[PDB]
Design goal:
This is part of a larger assembly, with 7 protein chains of 7 kinds.
Chain B: E1 6-15, E2 20-29, E3 45-58, E4 61-77, E5 82-87, E6 99-102
Chain F: no helix or strand
Chain G: H1 3-55, E1 66-71, H2 80-88, E2 96-101, H3 104-110, E3 117-120, H4 124-134, E4 136-139, E5 142-145, H5 149-156, H6 164-172, H7 178-184, E6 188-189, E7 211-212, H8 217-224
Parallel strand pairs in G: 3-7
Antiparallel strand pairs in G: 1-2, 1-3, 2-6, 4-5
Helix pairs in contact in G: 4-6
The chains are: A little secondary structure (128), B mainly beta (109), C alpha+beta (216), D mainly alpha (44), E alpha+beta (124), F little secondary structure (4), G alpha+beta (225).
The structure holds magnesium ion (15 copies).
One magnesium ion (MG) binds at residues 40-41 of chain A.
The structure holds 2 RNA strands.
RNA sequence: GGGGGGCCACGCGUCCCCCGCGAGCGCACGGGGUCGGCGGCGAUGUCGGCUACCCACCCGACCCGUCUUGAAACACGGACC
RNA sequence: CGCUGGCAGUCGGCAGAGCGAGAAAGAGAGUGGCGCGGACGCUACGCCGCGACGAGUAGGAGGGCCGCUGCGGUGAGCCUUGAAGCCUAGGGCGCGGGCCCGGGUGGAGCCGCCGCAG
């Protein structure tokens, strides 16, 4: 009884690993978040063989399947019941995520309205 | 009642000297050592058969420890009976020097 | 109201006729063949008479649709595809089944069905292989033949006869065509010496045996 | 390699491919009877 | 004009939501609820709105009359359609096509009216 | 007008 | 009323259909005559050689008016004078090919770009293979594939070049509008030579590749095309 | 110019030099793939999860910043947060 | 990046559904011999179509629905039926900067959009 999308094309991702920062492994002060190396002798920005890769524009996802969940839907953040009548006409391509700061009492009412509006919820059993 | 596959050795990957390409495997089928004798094996189906810890479902049988990476001979390699094969997942490098099967059922005769 | 006629030129190669445009005009003789120039229904009731609508308008529309697709031309369904069959597989030959539960068994080829699959019964008194289809890719065709030209295969043995329905139990129809084919196959393979024993054996590879060195 | 694309760009290719089939068949039919008359010349 | 006030409301309206790489509108008469010039429910002289009824069943169809444009109290006429799923789909289509009332919104109105009737069904 |  | 409008639009559609059929017949009989011209040009050179050998003299054929030029090295470390000539020959990439008509002003440029190219005298079948398989037109400064004769006829139709056969004729026999017909063609984006090069760095008469291979450019054309 | 095979040649009625609409019906090397084709397994041990936890193997792989013509440097700064 | 390309023609019973085609220009006007029907679109700062191209230190420019803090507006925004913060072998999105959900911890405030300021 899952809610199917309009179409479900095959999602092609050119890379599934993260782009980790250079030398984020030898230090705890160096976080995993990407910083482009700009040193004069840096072996990573000079693109030496066998090193950490750099986030070029060529890794960009296909525009038909960009920002699309593995269920085939795209995502919209929802805070209250009123934001679902926004999504009822975009029903077969966009789904709802109830926001984290929404209480369980209102979160029950949101998924109750989404069930009759046939809108898919990515977290319907979230808090209870 | 008997063996229905040809013996092959996973010799290594398709490579240069300082670069290797893991999506193509080099295969050494037993008994063929020249390019004029390897057109029989072109297009045949390859099988890396191995065993693991967890049980997996077997088509037409009870679950067991055995699982296989399937593949296919694509072209001849070299000048001495080696062939190239492509597999659906790239072969693990612990299988270098190990037996894989070349089936006969993609048959042209 | 004309009787349909065949193509008046033979196929020289595919896509090219043997006779040209003017020669074909002459063969067809167009020189004396010149020419020049719901929805509703009425139904009664017991007041008036109703124009009842066929194919009424839909009661529901989805929020989004998919558009129509562009038109291709060479793409036919599987029931209209041409059936290729390699030259080594002629009726009466001996095959080796490679992929079923009948692995390595020597069997007798009868005919190719409409789906392209091969109708095979290597006889059940020898092989325990019934009247059963197999695919021609997964078959080794041995160069060992018998004369089979006087064997009357029943006409109901078709693709729908061997398609699965849904424990599977043998039926008496499949049991009596099994006897009917085998009663006229078995004296033709019992004439050639050692052929029934060759059929009862199972093909296998041993040490030093390479399939590209041996001929079949 | 595509015949009807070739005829779309060049309609005379239909006759230039009907010939070099017809005359090749006729020359093949001539050489086989010539070779069969040689086999009769070495039989008589 | 409609274009003139669209150039004001296209980016700094209070009905506009821009998140998750999408844009919408919470406008009362915006059927399909998206931010565009064609579907905007307040800049045009002739607007069509399709909403659920106040009680459980029925579909309310709202039009905007041509006379009172600066008079929003009596501007919108409202009708309630508590019928079967097919005659309402013929009725709204008639109200748009035969009256020639903003004719490029007819299938959007039918698609909204079908969704309201589907939402008013018992859930499974 | 040649074919009528 | 519309009964006159429908038949008027039908007569317009019919006139468009007859104008197309007359053009197709024109293309067919143009190619049929080009066949006869190629047969005459092939048989005449054999005849003129035989009739000289009968009298005991020698027949000297005319030097060919057409050449095919292929750039056979990369873009790294190139002299500036040679870069300018390689750009005026439209050979901006390795394994690019172009048709060049031959005169003194062309031979003195091919001598300048001699170690970086491999040029020669193309066959008629070589021109057929090159224009049919790799033929792309420069239309509105865009590389457009020659998939229909209208694409040629829309740009080169003022020079009476209206199909593939007219284009191949004006390339093979270097005609009046050879400059326009050759500049309409995009430079030929050819693959690497199958089988392999002999030696890229040396001249053809030194057992290499560079320079003028006179009759042997076709052997490179089949393995590179 | 005179007295067996392929032709994108097949009108009638003149003057004259050279002696503007036929309908239908299907097939397809024709403006980028479809099947109107199928088979196996699936409720307490199995199916899918590329990414993320650990481990194994093959190939690659010198520590960053900086000055410098030139840094992995037996050039300087740097234990870690 | 270029074509300083295309689309306001969604022109519907006040209807007639087109501008790819080798050849400057009008599917122009007049004057005489049953069945009530037809997908999507167009945030024009939007959408769509053809080609060609893609190294980079010093440096320059553009785009950030990348990020932090505060202010004017705005979400009939979120919140003791649990905010900020923190932890996480959990599920994901984005080339990336980063972000959204799930679990736990915690006990009182916090965020999205349009602009402004550092
Ligand atoms: Mg440096
Ligand atoms: Mg075992
Ligand atoms: Mg160099
Ligand atoms: Mg080779
Ligand atoms: Mg050199
Ligand atoms: Mg190593
Ligand atoms: Mg320094
Ligand atoms: Mg120094
Ligand atoms: Mg420097
Ligand atoms: Mg350094
Ligand atoms: Mg040192
Ligand atoms: Mg110092
Ligand atoms: Mg120190
Ligand atoms: Mg760059
Ligand atoms: Mg951690």
């Amino acid at each position: 009884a899952a809610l199917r999308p309009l179409v479900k094309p095959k999602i092609v991702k050119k890379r599934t690993k993260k782009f980790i920062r250079h030398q984020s492994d030898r230090y705890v002060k160096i976080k995993r978040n990407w910083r482009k190396p700009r040193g004069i002798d840096n072996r990573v920005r000079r693109r030496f063989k066998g090193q950490i890769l750099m986030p070029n524009i060529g890794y960009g996802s296909n525009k038909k399947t960009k920002h699309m969940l593995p269920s085939g839907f795209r995502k919209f953040l929802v805070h209250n019941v009123k934001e679902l009548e926004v999504l009822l006409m975009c029903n077969k391509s966009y789904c709802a995520e109830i926001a984290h700061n929404v209480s369980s009492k209102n979160r029950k009412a949101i998924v109750e309205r989404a069930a009759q509006l046939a809108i898919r919820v990515t977290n319907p059993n979230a808090r209870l | 009642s008997g063996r229905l596959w040809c013996k092959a050795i996973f010799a290594g990957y398709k490579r240069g000297l300082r670069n290797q390409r893991e999506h193509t495997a080099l295969l050494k089928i037993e008994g063929v050592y020249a390019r004029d004798e390897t057109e029989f094996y072109l297009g045949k189906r390859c099988a890396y058969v191995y065993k693991a810890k967890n049980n997996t479902v077997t088509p037409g049988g009870k679950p067991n420890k055995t699982r296989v990476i399937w593949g296919k001979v694509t072209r001849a390699h070299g000048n001495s009976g080696m062939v190239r094969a492509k597999f659906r997942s790239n072969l693990p490098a612990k299988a270098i020097g190990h037996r894989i099967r070349v089936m006969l059922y993609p048959s042209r005769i | 109201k004309g009787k349909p006629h065949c193509s008046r030129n033979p196929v020289l190669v595919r896509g090219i006729g043997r006779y040209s445009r003017s020669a074909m005009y002459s063969r067809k003789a167009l020189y004396k063949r010149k020419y020049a120039a719901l929805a509703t229904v009425t139904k009664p009731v017991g007041g008036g008479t109703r124009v009842v609508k066929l194919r009424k308008m839909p009661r529901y529309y989805p929020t989004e649709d998919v558009p129509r697709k562009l038109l291709s031309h060479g793409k036919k369904p599987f029931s209209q595809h041409v059936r290729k069959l390699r030259a080594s597989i002629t009726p009466g030959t001996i095959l080796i089944i490679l992929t079923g539960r009948h692995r390595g068994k020597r069997v007798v080829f009868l005919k190719q069905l409409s789906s392209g699959l091969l109708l095979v019964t290597g006889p059940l008194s020898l092989n325990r292989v019934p009247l059963r289809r197999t695919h021609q890719k997964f078959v080794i065709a041995t160069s060992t033949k018998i004369d089979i030209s006087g064997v009357k295969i029943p006409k109901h043995l078709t693709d729908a006869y061997f398609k699965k329905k849904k424990k599977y139990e043998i039926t008496e129809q499949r049991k009596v065509d099994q006897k009917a084919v085998d009663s006229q196959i078995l004296p033709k393979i019992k004439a050639v010496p050692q052929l029934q024993g060759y059929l009862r054996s199972v093909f296998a590879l041993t040490n030093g045996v390479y399939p590209h060195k041996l001929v079949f | 390699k595509n015949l009807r694309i070739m005829l779309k760009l060049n309609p005379y290719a239909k006759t230039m491919r009907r010939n070099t089939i017809l005359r090749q068949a006729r020359n093949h039919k001539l050489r086989v009877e010539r070779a069969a008359a040689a086999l009769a010349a070495k039989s008589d | 004009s409609a274009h003139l006030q669209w150039m004001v409301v296209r980016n700094c309206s209070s009905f506009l939501i821009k998140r998750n790489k999408q844009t919408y509108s919470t406008e009362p008469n915006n059927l399909k609820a998206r931010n565009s010039f064609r579907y905007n429910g307040l800049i045009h002289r002739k607007t069509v709105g399709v909403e659920p009824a106040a009680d459980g069943k029925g579909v309310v169809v709202v039009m905007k009359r041509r006379s009172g444009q600066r008079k929003p109290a009596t501007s919108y006429v409202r009708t309630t359609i508590n019928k079967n799923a097919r005659a309402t789909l013929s009725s709204i289509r008639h109200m748009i096509r035969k009256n020639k009332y903003h004719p490029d919104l007819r299938m959007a109105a039918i698609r909204r009216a079908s969704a309201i009737l589907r939402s008013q069904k018992p859930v499974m | 007008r040649g074919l009528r | 009323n519309f009964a006159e409008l429908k038949i008027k639009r039908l007569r317009k559609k019919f006139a468009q259909k007859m104008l197309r059929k007359a053009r197709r017949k024109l293309i067919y009989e143009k190619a049929k005559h080009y066949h006869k011209e190629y047969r005459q040009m092939y048989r005449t050179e054999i005849r003129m050689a035989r009739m000289a050998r009968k009298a005991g003299n020698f027949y000297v054929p005319a030097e060919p008016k057409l050449a095919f030029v292929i750039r056979i090295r990369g873009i790294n470390g190139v002299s500036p004078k040679v870069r300018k000539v390689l750009q005026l020959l439209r050979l901006r990439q390795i394994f690019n090919g172009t048709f060049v008509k031959l005169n003194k002003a062309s031979i003195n440029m091919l001598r300048i770009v001699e170690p970086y190219i491999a040029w020669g005298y193309p066959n008629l079948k070589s021109v057929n293979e090159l224009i049919y398989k790799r033929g792309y037109g420069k239309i509105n400064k865009k590389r457009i594939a020659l998939t229909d004769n209208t694409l040629i006829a829309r740009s080169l139709g003022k020079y009476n070049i209206i199909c593939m056969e007219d284009l191949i004729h004006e390339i093979y026999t270097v005609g009046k509008h050879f400059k326009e017909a050759n500049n309409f063609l995009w430079p030929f984006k050819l693959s690497s030579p199958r089988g392999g090069m002999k030696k890229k760095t040396t001249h053809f008469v030194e057992g290499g590749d560079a320079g003028n291979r006179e009759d042997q450019i076709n052997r490179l054309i089949r393995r590179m095309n």
